[PDB]
Amino acid sequence: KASKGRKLNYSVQDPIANYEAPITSGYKWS
Amino acid sequence: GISRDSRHKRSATGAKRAQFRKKRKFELGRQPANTKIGAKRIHSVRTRGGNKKYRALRIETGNFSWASEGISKKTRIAGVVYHPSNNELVRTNTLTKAAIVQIDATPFRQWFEAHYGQTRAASAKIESSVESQFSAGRLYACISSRPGQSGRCDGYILEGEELAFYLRRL
Amino acid sequence: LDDTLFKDEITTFLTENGSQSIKAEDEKVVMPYVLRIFFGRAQVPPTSGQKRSRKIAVISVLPNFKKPYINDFLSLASERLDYNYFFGNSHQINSSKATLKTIRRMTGFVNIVNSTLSVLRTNFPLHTNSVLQPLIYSIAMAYYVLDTESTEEVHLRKMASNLRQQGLKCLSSVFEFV
Amino acid sequence: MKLNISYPVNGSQKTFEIDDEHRIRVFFDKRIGQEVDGEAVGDEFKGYVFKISGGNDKQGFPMKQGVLLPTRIKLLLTKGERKRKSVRGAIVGPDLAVLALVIVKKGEQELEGLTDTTVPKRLGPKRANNIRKFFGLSKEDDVRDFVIRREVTKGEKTYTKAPKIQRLVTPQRLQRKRHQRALKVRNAQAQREAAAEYAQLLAKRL
Amino acid sequence: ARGPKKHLKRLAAPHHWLLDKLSGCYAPRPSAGPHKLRESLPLIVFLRNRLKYALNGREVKAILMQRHVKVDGKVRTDTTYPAGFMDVITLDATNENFRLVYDVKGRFAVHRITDEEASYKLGKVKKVQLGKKGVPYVVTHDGRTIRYPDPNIKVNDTVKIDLASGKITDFIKFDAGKLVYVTGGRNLGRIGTIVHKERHDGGFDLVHIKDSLDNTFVTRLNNVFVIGEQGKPYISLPKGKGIK
Amino acid sequence: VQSERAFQKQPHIFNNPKVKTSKRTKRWYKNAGLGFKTPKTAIEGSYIDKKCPFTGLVSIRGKILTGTVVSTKMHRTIVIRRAYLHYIPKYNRYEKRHKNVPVHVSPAFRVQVGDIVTVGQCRPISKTVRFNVVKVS
RNA sequence: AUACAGUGAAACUGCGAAUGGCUCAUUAAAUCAGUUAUCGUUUAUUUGAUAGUUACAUGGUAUAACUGUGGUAAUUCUAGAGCUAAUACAUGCAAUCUCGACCCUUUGGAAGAGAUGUAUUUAUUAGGAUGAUUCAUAAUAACUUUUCGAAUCGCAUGGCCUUGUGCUGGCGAUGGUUCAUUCAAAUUUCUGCCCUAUCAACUUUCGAUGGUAGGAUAGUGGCCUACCAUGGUUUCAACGGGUCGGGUCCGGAGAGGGAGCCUGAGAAACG
Ligand SMILES: [Mg+2]
Ligand SMILES: [Mg+2]
Ligand SMILES: [Mg+2]
């Protein structure tokens, strides 16, 4: 079942780790 | 990029084989040809040797064969209805071999009136379901060719227990 | 007119109930143009695999038309042949009309009828002036040429034999279907 | 700027250097393939029409048709192989060093080096039908007499040179066609005879 | 190598050519042709290292380009043309005709023949099948495709090919008591009579051969070439008659 | 039989409904050779198997082996065991060795864990299946 | 040599550049050594067979070399003009064989009836070879952005007459459809001497094992994908750890880094 990725795997993936950085300012509205 | 080499897979015991060598040209694969209904649109592919493979990216007409009556006519393909391997090919209306499509029945209807002079009688008798489809205006057919290889969408009309089983699945 | 798109245009433009099919109101004006165009394509000599397919396609679109138009197409084929004098008189052929050129036109006419009989079969529309009269006049011409002409005209005799052989084939078919 | 003007009917071409910026201005903002009136350029060009065809900038890079800019850009050029190379835009501007023009139509006055002078075609027709077209020969006429001959003199020696007619009907070609047809006939006949002998052998065996 | 080879080192050349080991570093690589690479004798070797008629490759090239050498009744100009078993080589100027036959040692022997014996060759029918338009044909060992063969002819039979027309003159069936030439294995070049043909479906058939001295030896069927019925071979044999 | 998303049929074997000559669906078969008897259950059966050597598009050629069935827990495939004695010269001694061979088994055969099977080589059916059961005993 | 004709730079076409050479970092059935299959595939070339289905020869929808004008600091950098060819690029054209009355003449003529490419795709029908085939092969109906079926060249100028350069022609070259053959390539069956348990579980943690169907492949094949089954190896040692191959030759790789493409029969190209 888990084969072919059909089951969701939450283990960290190094290549995509820190692919982007969050904006601290947040959404435009308060 | 696509490759067919079996070295990358695990051995029968389950060991992880090491990357033996770089990818070779004699073990290549090419991207799939997602044939979709529309204006005919094909481009050649120069394959190993001097041979050429036609990629049917788009197609809307095909030769379909009534096997029981042993005749063949060129007809428009209405749309995909049921595909055994994956359903989402039905949703996007993708054409590949074994896909069941709906084809215009008009040329077969005209030919049948021509040959039998009926809209002698015993021979004219045909399965009830096929006559019902003729009344509907669309015929369930199975594509026999491989649109991703030969550039054609040739096939045949479902009949008999073929038609019964596929109608049940529908 | 374009050769490459000829086939796909037929299955789209002329297919009955087709989305791109001509409107019933526009059938009267357009169809005379269509019949003439196909008549030109039907005279292509079938020397190759593709050329044979084009001829069959031209004849295979006919059932899609309405019956009056089918008669119109047949009338065009017989128009060049002059047969009115033959039936007008007591079934007497003119020597002047008896030529290699006249036989060639007859063979072209008969070939169209033979193909059209195959596709339409029982539904073929048969009319005296349009088909049967020119068809009869052709077979009479073959007999007259065969007997009158000397053995020297080996080509003309051969062509006459072909027309008779095709002419009798045509008559055998038209009785069988209609 | 320098203007390289060519008269194609002549085949002639000459360069005119320009100093005043006002004819250069009427040339500004135009595009390759457009037309300009010579009278704006100068009285010497009064009544003329120039079609812009090409040119080069102060850095020597050529302009290319189809690109709409007044500046240079690295464009992917072709004729199989394709190279990213710098090219000027097709918009005429002050950045252009030399501008090439073709005289579409002639004005009132005649240019000294262009409308007065000719440069003959370097070579004449070689294919037979091209000879017939050039001289308008009838079919009955034989092209062999009308072929263009150029005289060549070496010191005191002198002799005529003429091209070799291609696509000419000559007995050799008729012979070749006849031989091909006869060869096909002979092969067919031999094959039929072989088939007949094979059938006879089977008949004897049975 | 990433494609077809074109060079053949001397030490890697077949042993039976008997090439001098000190002459150089390369040997003639037989071009593609009727015969296999390992079972062929290129014309350069035959003309230079066997007949000694040429002193170097250039002289062989001159000899051929004069159009003096005929291989099976047809002029050949390729120095490395692969002449092979039952091949007829004609030199008209020297009034010499040769047929290539393995001696008892197993190397190609210079065997002079009469012109009448040069007018034909022998071919083992390697395959029989129907071609296009339903015309039966036979493929022999030397690659000749002969159409309209005799129906009786079957695989492993041997046909008599006239060179001028390339047609079958007669044929010999494969049977016990027939005279056979060994064209491979350890017994190459020996001559004998068939005694019994063992058959193993899905495997290599074996045959027993008895020589005139009554010694017996077994060989695979592929390496047998029928040359006639006992005591009446259809070709001239080399000296010794393939004994021992 | 028709227990799959796609229909199962012997390819290019046509059954004309209009003529309706025979009640039995037309069935195609061949004999594998090497003296291996084609069973009747294949001939008048009703299964569909593309990899059956007697009814499928497969041919038996090459080596023919024998073994003991060790597993039959799959759909139409099994694992057999071939034993032998490997000789080490250094200790001049034999040691018992075994190899597990996966094999395709046609549904026309019935096989239990323990019986002896003779199998024939065929074109690669899967990642590991290169053989096909051809005689059960 | 009044079209050219000897020789011939340049340029366009054709072929070749995947051979040869060189170094050993890698990897312990991965390659490899022996052995087997392709009824599971592609193959330039060689060799042998093989295509009767405006024409006294079509176009520039064409350019190089070449002539001539220039830009730039400048390159195997450049644009504008003007020519001209093909085995380049396009287009393209009154016959044979069956059954044979008359049984006329008894080889024979013969009225009449008929039949007549290849290539791709599908459907359907028949089916000499091998142990074995849905094999070879043949036929039917259609399909094609779909082919191919000499608009080519050298040497020579013979035989007929109906004197027109009328008809009919000898030896070669280069092409081309399919099959076979050869050079090869690709997978593939079985077997194959180190120490190890102080390496006992491993695979299934983006297929692991198998079926059905499709996509891709030159093809077979979880090679990739959708659905479904729960498996495969191992105490007779799986899994793990340590330590160029065989015999100058035969194998095996690799030549700024990594990714992506391209032609060609052959490369993931030393381009
Ligand atoms: Mg400057
Ligand atoms: Mg090449
Ligand atoms: Mg599959």
Crossing angle, helix C154-177 and helix C100-120, to 10 degrees?
30
Q: How far apart are the C-alpha atoms of D136 and D125, rounded to whole Å?
A: 12
Q: How far apart are the C-alpha atoms of C72 and E76, rounded to whole Å?
A: 68
Is chain B adjacent to chain F, meaning 3+ CB pairs within 8 angstroms?
yes
Q: How far apart are the C-alpha atoms of B88 and B99, rounded to whole Å?
A: 12
Q: How far apart are the C-alpha atoms of E233 and E172, rounded to whole Å?
A: 11
Q: How far is E201 from chain F (nearest CA, A)?
A: 7
| Lookup: tokens for E97 | 């005709």
Taking CB atoms and an 8 Å cutoff, what residues of chain B touch C8? 40, 61
C11:B110 CB<8 A: no
Q: Quickly give B78 CA vs G142 C1' distance in Å.
A: 20
Other chains touching C, judged by 3 or more CB pairs under 8 Å: B
Identify how the structure was determined: cryo-EM
**What is the distance, to the nearest Å, from the Cα of residue C32 to the centroid of all Cα atoms in its chain?**
16
CB B83 within 8 A of CB B100: yes
Q: Of D120, D146, D178, which closes a domain? A: D120
**Element containing residue E128 per DSSP (H, E):** strand E120-130
With distances taken from each CA to the C1' atom of nucleotide G248, the closest residue turns out to be E11
The reply to whether E129 and E153 lie within a common domain is yes
C28 burial (CB, 10 Å; 0-12 / 13-18 / 19+) is exposed
C170's CB contacts (< 8 A; 6+ apart) are: C110, C113, C114, C117, C135
The 3-class secondary structure across chain F, one letter per residue, is: CCCCCCCCCCCCCCCCCCCCCCCCCCCCCCCCECCECCCHHHHCCCCCCCCCCCCCCCCCCCCEEEEEEEECCCCCEEEEEEEEEEEECCCCEEEEEEEEEEEECCCCCCCCCCCEEEEEECCCCCCCCCEEEEEEC
CB-nearest to C11 from B74, B113, B114 is B74
Give me the phi and psi of E188, to 5 degrees please. Answer: -55, 140
Q: Is the CB of D102 under 7 A from strand G?
A: yes
Residue C69 half-sphere exposure, CB side, CA atoms within 13 Å?
20
Alpha helices in chain B (DSSP H): 88-91, 106-116, 121-124, 128-136, 147-150, 161-169
Residue C121 backbone class (left: φ over 0; alpha: ψ -120 to 50; beta: rest): left
Calculate the CA dihedral of residues E134, E136, E137, E138 and round it to 10 degrees.
140
In this structure, how many other beta carbons lie within 10 angstroms of the beta carbon of residue C27? 16
Q: How far apart are the C-alpha atoms of F88 and F91, rounded to whole Å?
A: 6
Q: How far apart are the C-alpha atoms of C101 and F46, rounded to whole Å?
A: 65
Give me the phi and psi of C115, to 5 degrees please. Answer: -65, -45
The reply to whether E108 and E205 lie within a common domain is no
Which structural domain range is residue F136 located in? 1-137
Distance D95 CA to ligand 1 centre (A): 11
Crossing angle, helix C154-177 and helix C133-148, to 10 degrees?
150
Give the residue among F108, F1, F133, F132 at the shortest CA–CA distance from F44. F108
The reply to whether D79 and D26 lie within a common domain is yes
In this structure, how many other beta carbons lie within 10 angstroms of the beta carbon of residue F132? 25
CB F85 within 8 A of CB F97: yes
Nucleotides of G under 7 A from a protein CB: 2-5, 17-21, 27-28, 30-31, 36-40, 42-53, 56-60, 65-74, 77-86, 93-98, 112-114, 117-125, 128-134, 136-138, 140-150, 152-157, 165-166, 168-172, 178-193, 202-227, 229-240, 248-250, 252-254, 259-268
For chain A, the distance separating the N- and C-terminal CA atoms, rounded to the nearest angstrom, is 44
Q: In what order do the strands lie in the sheet with B94-95?
A: B41-46, B52-59, B35-37, B94-95
Q: How many residues does chain F have?
A: 137
Q: How far is F34 from chain E (nearest CA, A)?
A: 7
Q: How far apart are the C-alpha atoms of C165 and C161, rounded to whole Å?
A: 6
With distances taken from each CA to the C1' atom of nucleotide G203, the closest residue turns out to be B14
Q: How far apart are the C-alpha atoms of C18 and D184, rounded to whole Å?
A: 49
Give me the phi and psi of C103, to 5 degrees please. Answer: -65, -40
Which structural domain range is residue E182 located in? 174-244
Which structural domain range is residue D203 located in? 121-206
Resolution in angstrom units:
3.7
Distances (CA, A) of B143 to B82, B168, E4, F96: 12, 19, 42, 54
Q: Of D88, D120, D152, which closes a domain? A: D120
Give the residue among C8, C132, C129 at the shortest CA–CA distance from C61. C8
Q: How far apart are the C-alpha atoms of F55 and F10, rounded to whole Å?
A: 8
B106:C15 CB<8 A: yes
Q: What is the CATH number of the domain that holds E139?
A: 2.40.50.740
- D91 three-class SS: strand
Which stretches does DSSP call E strand in E34-119?
Answer: 41-42, 69-71, 74-75, 82-83, 88-91, 96-102, 108-112
Q: How far apart are the C-alpha atoms of D64 and D85, rounded to whole Å?
A: 11
Q: What is the CATH number of the domain that holds E69?
A: 3.10.290.10
Give the type of residue at E142.
Answer: D
Calculate the CA dihedral of residues C80, C82, C87, C93 and round it to 10 degrees.
-140
Give the residue among D46, D17, B141, C170 at the shortest CA–CA distance from D36. D46
The reply to whether D173 and D201 lie within a common domain is yes
The reply to whether E25 and E91 lie within a common domain is yes
Q: How far apart are the C-alpha atoms of C170 and C159, rounded to whole Å?
A: 16
Distance D97 CA to ligand 1 centre (A): 10
Q: What is the largest CA-CA distance in chain F?
A: 75
CB-nearest to D205 from E147, E148, E151 is E151
The reply to whether D112 and D126 lie within a common domain is no
CB E181 within 8 A of CB E242: yes
Taking CB atoms and an 8 Å cutoff, what residues of chain E touch D197? 148
Distances (CA, A) of E160 to E97, E121, E242: 18, 6, 21
Q: Which residue, chain included where needed, has tokens 């850095």? A: D59
The reply to whether E190 and E167 lie within a common domain is no
**What is the distance, to the nearest Å, from the Cα of residue D97 to the centroid of all Cα atoms in its chain?**
27
Calculate the CA dihedral of residues E145, E150, E152, E155 and round it to 10 degrees.
-10
Q: How far is D177 from chain E (nearest CA, A)?
A: 27
Q: Of D120, D136, D161, which closes a domain? A: D120
With distances taken from each CA to the C1' atom of nucleotide G125, the closest residue turns out to be B70
| Lookup: tokens for F9 | 């049929």
Please give the tally of structural domains in chain E.
3
Q: Is the CB of B9 under 7 A from strand G?
A: yes
Give the type of residue at F6.
Answer: A
As a whole number of Å, the CA-based R_g of chain B is: 21
Alpha helices in chain C (DSSP H): 6-9, 27-42, 49-60, 67-79, 84-88, 100-120, 133-148, 154-177
Q: How far apart are the C-alpha atoms of D172 and D167, rounded to whole Å?
A: 12
Q: How far apart are the C-alpha atoms of C107 and C103, rounded to whole Å?
A: 6
- D169 three-class SS: coil
Give the residue among E226, E31, E210 at the shortest CA–CA distance from E141. E226
The reply to whether E194 and E155 lie within a common domain is no
Give the type of residue at D37.
Answer: D
Q: Which residues are E45's β-sheet partners?
A: none
DSSP E49: I
Q: How far apart are the C-alpha atoms of C119 and E182, rounded to whole Å?
A: 66
**Element containing residue D180 per DSSP (H, E):** helix D171-205
Name the residue in chain D with its Cα closest to that of E149. D198
| Lookup: tokens for F30 | 């061949």
Give the residue among C55, C19, C4, C15 at the shortest CA–CA distance from B40. C4
Give the residue among F123, F124, F120 at the shortest CA–CA distance from F132. F120
Give the type of residue at F73.
Answer: K
Q: What is the CATH number of the domain that holds F28?
A: 2.40.50.1000
As a whole number of Å, the CA-based R_g of chain F is: 18
Q: Which nucleotide is nearest to F8 (CA to C1')?
A: G212
The reply to whether E224 and E194 lie within a common domain is yes
Q: How far apart are the C-alpha atoms of B17 and A30, rounded to whole Å?
A: 55
**Element containing residue D84 per DSSP (H, E):** strand D83-87
Please give the tally of structural domains in chain D.
2
Q: How far apart are the C-alpha atoms of C123 and C112, rounded to whole Å?
A: 16
Q: Is the CB of B168 under 7 A from strand G?
A: no
The reply to whether E34 and E90 lie within a common domain is yes
Q: How far is E184 from chain F (nearest CA, A)?
A: 23
B67:F14 CB<8 A: yes
The reply to whether D109 and D131 lie within a common domain is no
Sequence-separated contacts (24+) of B114-122 with Cβ below 8 Å: B114/C63, B114/C119, B114/C120, B114/C121, B114/C122, B114/C123, B115/C121, B115/C122, B116/C122, B117/C121, B117/C122, B117/C123
CB D19 within 8 A of CB D1: no
Nearest ligand for residue F124 CA: 3
CB E178 within 8 A of CB E229: yes
Residues 61-100 of D with CB under 7 A from strand G: 61-63, 80, 85, 97-98, 100
For chain D, the distance separating the N- and C-terminal CA atoms, rounded to the nearest angstrom, is 98
Q: Is the CB of B128 under 7 A from strand G?
A: no
CB C99 within 8 A of CB C127: no
Q: Is the CB of D117 under 7 A from strand G?
A: no
Q: How far apart are the C-alpha atoms of E202 and D25, rounded to whole Å?
A: 92
Calculate the CA dihedral of residues C150, C153, C157, C159 and round it to 10 degrees.
-160
CB D4 within 8 A of CB D100: yes
CB D12 within 8 A of CB D117: yes
Please give the tally of structural domains in chain F.
1
Give me the phi and psi of C40, to 5 degrees please. Answer: -65, -40
Other chains touching B, judged by 3 or more CB pairs under 8 Å: C, F
Give the residue among C159, C10, C11, C173 at the shortest CA–CA distance from C98. C159
Q: How far is C32 from chain B (nearest CA, A)?
A: 22
CB B2 within 8 A of CB B23: no
Q: Which residues are E103's β-sheet partners?
A: none
